[PDB]
Write an enzyme that holds these catalytic residues in place. Structure first.
Site, PDB file in Angstrom:
ATOM      1  N   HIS A   1       8.602  -5.738  -0.505  1.00  0.00           N
ATOM      2  CA  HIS A   1       7.366  -5.274  -1.019  1.00  0.00           C
ATOM      3  C   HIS A   1       7.547  -4.339  -2.202  1.00  0.00           C
ATOM      4  O   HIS A   1       6.701  -4.392  -3.063  1.00  0.00           O
ATOM      5  CB  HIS A   1       6.405  -4.715   0.056  1.00  0.00           C
TER       6      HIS A   1
ATOM      7  N   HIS B   1      10.322   5.040  -4.296  1.00  0.00           N
ATOM      8  CA  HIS B   1       9.942   3.682  -4.713  1.00  0.00           C
ATOM      9  C   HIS B   1       8.757   3.825  -5.630  1.00  0.00           C
ATOM     10  O   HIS B   1       8.224   4.921  -5.838  1.00  0.00           O
ATOM     11  CB  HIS B   1       9.576   2.816  -3.502  1.00  0.00           C
TER      12      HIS B   1
ATOM     13  N   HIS C   1       4.987   1.701  -6.992  1.00  0.00           N
ATOM     14  CA  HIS C   1       3.935   0.699  -6.907  1.00  0.00           C
ATOM     15  C   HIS C   1       3.549   0.399  -8.338  1.00  0.00           C
ATOM     16  O   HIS C   1       3.398   1.318  -9.133  1.00  0.00           O
ATOM     17  CB  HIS C   1       2.737   1.233  -6.116  1.00  0.00           C
TER      18      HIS C   1
ATOM     19  N   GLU D   1      -1.730   3.505  -6.954  1.00  0.00           N
ATOM     20  CA  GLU D   1      -2.454   3.496  -5.688  1.00  0.00           C
ATOM     21  C   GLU D   1      -3.549   4.597  -5.740  1.00  0.00           C
ATOM     22  O   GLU D   1      -4.734   4.287  -5.619  1.00  0.00           O
ATOM     23  CB  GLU D   1      -1.504   3.736  -4.526  1.00  0.00           C
TER      24      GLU D   1
ATOM     25  N   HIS E   1       6.618   7.260  -5.759  1.00  0.00           N
ATOM     26  CA  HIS E   1       6.528   7.966  -4.494  1.00  0.00           C
ATOM     27  C   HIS E   1       7.911   8.466  -4.065  1.00  0.00           C
ATOM     28  O   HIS E   1       8.792   7.630  -3.781  1.00  0.00           O
ATOM     29  CB  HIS E   1       5.987   7.058  -3.383  1.00  0.00           C
TER      30      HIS E   1
ATOM     31  N   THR F   1       0.644   3.900   2.913  1.00  0.00           N
ATOM     32  CA  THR F   1      -0.212   2.897   2.291  1.00  0.00           C
ATOM     33  C   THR F   1       0.220   1.519   2.527  1.00  0.00           C
ATOM     34  O   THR F   1      -0.348   0.553   1.976  1.00  0.00           O
ATOM     35  CB  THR F   1      -0.326   3.118   0.759  1.00  0.00           C
ATOM     36  N   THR F   2       1.227   1.312   3.401  1.00  0.00           N
ATOM     37  CA  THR F   2       1.737   0.049   3.844  1.00  0.00           C
ATOM     38  C   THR F   2       1.654   0.047   5.362  1.00  0.00           C
ATOM     39  O   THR F   2       1.821   1.109   5.968  1.00  0.00           O
ATOM     40  CB  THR F   2       3.169  -0.215   3.380  1.00  0.00           C
TER      41      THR F   2
END
Ligand code: NI
Ligand code: NI
Length: 257
Positions: free
Chosen positions: A61, A91, A93, A103, A116, A195-196
């Site tokens: 992801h 990581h 997004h 996000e 993040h 958020t996952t």
């Protein structure tokens, strides 16, 4: 059973993880005019001088740059936090286009990406215990806009060819996460969630006001990664962001006037 497609994306997650519709979900829109300065906040302390990066992993992801979190080598303290939080991984997004990818949003504005830096509260002993607590994690979030290159990002970008597909990892020692930070540590904070999936409500979010700039070429390299494993059909790893969730009974606090 989850991802970022039409058939398995954010809007489906609640069927497996009903916490998706909970009281403290992330991300959120940060309404800059409604956030309130909080005098009770202490100064933020980012102590990354002894950081030990280990490895970079494409987990299907995102990609995670993982750290040695068996000692207080890279820790976050202060701000809204009580106690010591150890860096485990960072990581990003990001989007398919420069106009989306973050996000969090700021007055409804989407950035090209969001970094993040994930930390866990050492009072809980390990990450897996921390995520079961309401104050288990502290995530430092940093917006990325496209403009000049970020020099301290380049070492990350250049290893991405070696981790193209899900499940690939590579050694990634001696990386200094200080080279990813903006000049100012001014921030917004609120209580939220992963958020996952599994969407656990365990995060104190600390979102920096000042974005960092990365180049077109740098973001384009993110977009060449794959969600799939090697030998499966190619699906570009883009748009791996959950959209803003309802704020519900929360107030966002600002560290600055
Ligand atoms: Ni699955
Ligand atoms: Ni994240």
């Amino acid at each position: 059973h989850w991802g970022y497609g039409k058939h398995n994306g954010p809007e489906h997650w609640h069927k497996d993880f009903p916490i998706a519709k909970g009281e403290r979900q992330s991300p959120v829109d940060i309404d800059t005019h409604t956030a309130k300065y909080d005098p009770s906040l202490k100064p933020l302390s980012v102590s990354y001088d002894q950081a030990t990066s280990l490895r970079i992993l494409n987990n299907g992801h995102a990609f995670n740059v993982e750290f040695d979190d068996s000692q207080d080598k890279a820790v976050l303290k202060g701000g809204p936090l009580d106690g010591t939080y150890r860096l485990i991984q960072f990581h990003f997004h990001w989007g398919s286009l420069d106009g989306q990818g973050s996000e969090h949003t700021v007055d409804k504005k989407k950035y090209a990406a969001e970094l993040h830096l994930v930390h866990w509260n050492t009072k809980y002993g390990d990450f897996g215990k921390a995520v079961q607590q309401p104050d288990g994690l502290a995530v430092l979030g940093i917006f990325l806009k496209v403009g000049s290159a970020k020099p301290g990002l380049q070492k990350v970008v250049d290893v991405l060819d070696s981790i193209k597909t899900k499940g690939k990892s590579a050694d990634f020692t001696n990386f200094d996460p200080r080279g990813l930070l903006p000049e100012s540590l001014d921030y917004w904070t609120y209580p939220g969630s992963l958020t996952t999936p599994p969407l656990l409500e365990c995060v104190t979010w600390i979102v920096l006001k000042e974005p960092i700039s990365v180049s077109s070429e740098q973001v384009l390299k993110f977009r060449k990664l794959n969600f799939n494993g090697e030998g499966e059909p190619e699906e570009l790893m883009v748009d791996n962001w959950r959209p803003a969730q309802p704020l519900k009974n929360r107030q966002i606090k600002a560290s600055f006037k």
